[PDB]
Amino acid sequence: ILDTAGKEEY
Amino acid sequence: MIQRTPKIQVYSRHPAENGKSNFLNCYVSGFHPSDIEVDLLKNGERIEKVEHSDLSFSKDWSFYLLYYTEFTPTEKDEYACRVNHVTLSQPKIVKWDRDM
Amino acid sequence: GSHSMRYFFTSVSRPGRGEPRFIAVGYVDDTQFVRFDSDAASQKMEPRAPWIEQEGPEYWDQETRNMKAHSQTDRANLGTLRGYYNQSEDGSHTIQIMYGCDVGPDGRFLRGYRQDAYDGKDYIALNEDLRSWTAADMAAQITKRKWEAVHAAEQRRVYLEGRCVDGLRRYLENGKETLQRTDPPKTHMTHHPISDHEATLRCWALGFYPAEITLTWQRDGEDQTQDTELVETRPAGDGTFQKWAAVVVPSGEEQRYTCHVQHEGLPKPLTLRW
């Protein structure tokens, strides 16, 4: 199971 | 930005024996960035029929990957691995050691 | 005993030559079991392990889209960071992200992991409690401020404490005979003279699984930690790993030397002599 992109911003 | 120089290890999965099917490995690790070329040689010539692992990196963010191919160990032909990298002023070539 | 699950994600800029490349590789302990590559012919997530080939699109299709979202974000981050550090548009950049979890033998959650890096330098770390971010750079402090404000760690907790644990747990069962398998080293010792007086012994421990291995030399019953050379554990290219060690052994003194090979996967160590 892979994780889901959320607040993945710099 | 910083850069790291690859290490090159050339070996077989088991100790060489004449006529006994084997796999030629070239393990390249500890380099950065990912911009690297790794090729297997036979008598100095590139081997076309070569497979490799998927690129990964370790805790220190250094990159590593494996190249390998199937061959028949002999006494006539020599095997090696060639690696290029931006931190290398000269291409690195390592000879296959039958006993390691 | 305990088991580890890891995922490694890399995005590498490619000026001119299309879009930045995205690579993703998943591991259970020492075993790769899933892969993904933006330059793949399939453009989809692919299995590697037999015991995960039973998963349908109910995972793979969403996970593929998720990794696409990861790729899109990483690409944005690479451009954004270039801005932050006022770097040339003609330059290259690399971003590295990894996460995963450790579980006990009972599947109990032990530790969460999440770390980012940029151009070889640490970016942000998340503690094992998955509560608190740490910035290791200027841009990291900017990002950290954001992530803390929105409790980004909470998103990691839900996965790492839950989905990661159960996912790994199920895999450990389904792939029990492929993951928890053991393979003892093909131990042997060889003698390699150097000069009229000088020689070495080589202690071989090749073709073992898992990668976990310790080599020890002794002389006269006492540990030898000084006059020794060892290689780092390396793939055998056949599902097992290799390792060897050597020490300086003056001719005729070989009788005083002994090598030991210790594993956690074996009920007993192996001893080599010459």
Query: 3-state DSSP: chain B helix, strand, coil percent, rounded to 5?
Result: 0, 50, 50
Chain A: residue whose CA lies nearest to C155: A6
Neighbouring C-beta atoms of residue C105, cutoff 10 Å: 9
List CB contacts (< 8 A) between B16 and chain C: none
Are the Cβ atoms of C120 and B4 closer than 8 angstroms?
yes
C210: preceding bond cis by omega (within 30 degrees): yes
The fourth-level CATH superfamily of domain C182-274 is Immunoglobulins (2.60.40.10)
Spell out which residues of chain B touch residue C242, defining contact as CB-CB under 8 Å: 11, 13
Q: How far apart are CA C85 and CA C82, in angstroms?
A: 5
CATH of C1-181, one of 1.10.10.10, 3.30.420.40, 3.30.500.10, 3.40.190.10: 3.30.500.10
Q: Which residues of C touch B54 (CB under 8 A)?
A: 23, 25, 32, 35, 37
C 7-26 residues with CB below 8 A of A? 7, 24, 26
Experimental method: NMR
- The answer to whether C122 touches C137, Cβ cutoff 8 Å, is yes
Rounded Cα distance, C175 and C169, in Å? 10
Burial of C20 (C-beta count, 10 Å sphere; 0-12/13-18/19+): buried
Q: Which domains does chain B have, with CATH numbers?
A: 1-100 (2.60.40.10)
Residue C119: closest CA among C91, C159, C156, C100: C91
What residue type is C165 in one-letter code?
V
Provide the token pair at C141.
């402090």
Question: CA B80 to CA B50: how far, in whole Å?
Answer: 13
Chains with ≥3 Cβ pairs under 8 A against A? Answer: C
DSSP letter at C255? Answer: G
Q: What is the DSSP letter of C248?
A: E
Q: Where are the domains of chain C?
A: 1-181, 182-274
| CA atoms within 13 Å, Cβ hemisphere of B53 | 25
Does residue C32 sit at the B interface (CB-CB below 8 Å)?
A: yes
Amino acid (one-letter) located at C222: E
Q: Does C14 touch chain B (CB under 8 A)?
A: no
First to last CA, chain C: 34
Burial bucket for residue C272 (CB in 10 Å: 0-12, 13-18, 19+): buried
A5 contacts C147? CB cut-off 8 A: no
Cβ atoms of B22 and B73 closer than 8 Å: yes
C-chain residues near A10 (CB < 8 A): 76-77, 80-81, 84, 139, 142-143, 146
A2 contacts in C (CB within 8 Å)? 7, 24, 26, 34, 45, 63, 66-67
As beta bridge partners, residue B4 has B32
Sign, CA dihedral C163-C169-C173-C177, equals positive
Q: Does C85 touch chain A (CB under 8 A)?
A: no
Distance CA C62, CA C47 (A): 14
